[PDB]
Amino acid sequence: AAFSVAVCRFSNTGEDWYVLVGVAKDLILNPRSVAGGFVYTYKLVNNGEKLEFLHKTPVEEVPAAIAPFQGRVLIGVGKLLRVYDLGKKKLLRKCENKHIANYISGIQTI
Partner 1 sequence: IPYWLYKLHGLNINYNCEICGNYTYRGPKAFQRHFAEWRHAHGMRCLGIPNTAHFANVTQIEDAVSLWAKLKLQKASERWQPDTEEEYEDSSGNVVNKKTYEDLKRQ
Site for partner 1, residues 17 to 56, rule: CB under 8 A: none
Judged on CB neighbours under 10 Å (0-12, 13-18, 19+), 35 is exposed
Question: What is each CA distance from 36 to 43, 56, 61, 68, in whole angstroms?
Answer: 24, 12, 5, 23
Return phi, psi of residue 47, to 5°: 60, 30
Compare residues 26 and 96 and give the one whose CB is closer to partner 1. Answer: 96
To the nearest whole angstrom, how small is the minimum distance from the Cβ of residue 29 to partner 1? 26
Nearer to partner 1, 48 or 58 (CB): 58
Amino acid letter for position 94: K
Residue closer to partner 1, measured from CB, 27 or 85: 85
Closest approach of Cβ 99 to partner 1, in Å? 7
**Segment lying near partner 1 (by CB under 8 A), choices 24-32, 58-66, 84-92, 101-109:** 84-92
Binding to partner 1, residues 89-108 (CB under 8 A): 89-90, 92-99
Residue 39 CA to residue 42 CA, distance in Å, equals 10
